[PDB]
């Protein structure tokens, strides 16, 4: 494993901890959610993000953050605001961006020198 992969796996584990029912663990199918493929054209989930880390597909934390944001945005686009999926996506997007904030990454950059 590489230092980037270890850091991204840590961020992903902490993010997955906020989803105990595993709503974001797997891709959303049309059988589970009707007309999903018709509304969401750029699907994303924690499993796809895990596979990208393992394959060393992320060049930076910004790229990882972009996939996480896409996943939350998709859930907030497809699902109405009063659903468990929209509510969890909004909660984890905020919590995730504070964990991977420019402030926290600058503090990590300073500890790398
Ligand atoms: C059952 N159903 C209608 C439905 N709809 C939307 C979603 C969804 O966005 N995620 C992320 C996970 C499950 C899900 N399930």
DSSP 46-89: HHHHHHHHHTT--SSHHHHHHHHHHHHHHHHHHS-TTSHHHHHH
Nearest CA to ligand 1 atom 2: 33
Q: Decide: 97 in ligand 1 pocket, CB within 6 A.
A: no
| Pairwise CA distance, residues 74 & 23, whole Å | 13
Query: 2: Cβ–Cβ under 8 A, 6 or more apart, which residues?
Result: 56
Token pair belonging to 113: 């020198």
- The ligand 1 atom nearest the CA atom of 74: 9
Q: Please give the angle made by the CA atoms of 86, 11 and 20, to the nearest 5 degrees.
A: 45
Say how far apart CA 106 and CA 112 lie, in whole Å: 10
Question: Cβ(25)–Cβ(19) under 8 Å?
Answer: yes
CA distance 12 to 54: 12
Distances (CA, A) of 77 to 60, 67, 68, 81: 26, 15, 14, 9
- Per-residue CA distances from 40 to 35, 36, 70, 80 (Å): 9, 6, 10, 14
Any ligand 1 atom below 6 A from CB of 79? yes
Contact indicator for 42, 70 with CB cutoff of 8 Å: yes
Q: How far is 102 from 18, CA to CA, in rounded Å? A: 21
User: Which CB contacts under 8 angstroms, 24+ apart, belong to 54-57?
Assistant: 54/5, 56/2, 56/4, 56/5
Task: Map out the domains of the chain with their CATH numbers.
Answer: 1-113 (1.20.920.10)
Q: Are 42 and 57 in contact (CB under 8 A)?
A: no
């Amino acid at each position: 494993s590489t230092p980037i992969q270890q850091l991204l796996e840590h961020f992903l584990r902490q993010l997955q901890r906020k989803d105990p029912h595993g709503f974001f663990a797997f891709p959303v199918t049309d059988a589970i959610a009707p007309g999903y493929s018709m509304i969401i054209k750029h699907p994303m989930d924690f499993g796809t993000m895990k596979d990208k880390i393992v394959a060393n597909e992320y060049k930076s934390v910004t790229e990882f953050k972009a996939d996480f944001k896409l996943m939350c945005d998709n859930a907030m686009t497809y699902n109405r605001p009063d659903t468990v999926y929209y509510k969890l996506a909004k909660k984890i997007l905020h919590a995730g961006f504070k964990m991977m904030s420019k402030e926290r990454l600058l503090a990590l950059k300073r500890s790398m020198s």
